[PDB]
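Appendix B. Extra example for self-study. Work through it before the problem class; the solution is given directly after the inputs so you can check yourself.
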Amino acid sequence: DDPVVQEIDVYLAKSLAEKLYLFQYPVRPASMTYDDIPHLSAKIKP
Amino acid sequence: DQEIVQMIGTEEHVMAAFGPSLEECQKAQIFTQMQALKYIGNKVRRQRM
Amino acid sequence: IINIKKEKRETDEETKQILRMLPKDVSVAELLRELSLTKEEELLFLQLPDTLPGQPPTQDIAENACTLADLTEGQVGKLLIRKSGRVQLLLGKVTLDVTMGTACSFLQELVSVGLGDSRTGEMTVLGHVKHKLVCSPDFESLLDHK
Amino acid sequence: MLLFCPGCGNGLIVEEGQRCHRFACNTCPYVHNITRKVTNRKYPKLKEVDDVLGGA
Ligand SMILES: [Zn+2]
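Solution. Structure tokens for the complete assembly:
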């Protein structure tokens, strides 16, 4: 059972290490996207 | 309510069993954490310790 | 009538209640379909173990939490798709095992928060998150090793 | 079947509007006109067995 296919290189990046957030909507199925809704404001406390 | 229904179970009989509870909660006008907290506080007694 | 702003059915895989008139994958199948059949790059989200098989390089360390952040750029690991569907992640001397996470059917969008100014930030959506991966040490290999 | 508002995630209810009957949300103006028939079969379990008795 050799690694028969796709010995894949894995790299690490840090350009956006501090800038990266993962947002998930538990109520919104992946079918619909907020790419069509024009957003108005975004307030954050870092 | 969608979160609660997803969170109990997504089998058809599960929603069938859980429907009366949703109808009951919609009978009252509780839609905000504040309203439900107020309702609970009213139903909570001063069991003063 | 709008076909994209419809109401929802409870079953996400069968969200389309009305018509115009699913298999559960494994890492070998997942990577095979997303590489061989499709050349399009895809966004994945994976949960690594708590500590990586390294030491924080002059980061003031006690065998403390050596996470992904403490490491540096460049090639960091090797992913091997073995026969019989076995998939492993050689991370130097150790070999982690990679598995399907729970298949989330809701919307997971990976955004970038670029704080260009003190009072300004660039909300940069990068792509949807379709699959989730889990990496765990092959504790059996570690044990029968010694 | 239990329909929930995509706008805010609350449970949609049935009501009657002006052009037709609509699913409506009690918290936000999201409504959906019922454009054609919608059914929700239950298929309740029947009384299959008869069970005469007196055997050995
Ligand atoms: Zn609503």
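Self-check: Residues 6 and 126 of chain C are 26 Å apart (CA to CA). If your reasoning did not lead you there, revisit section 3.
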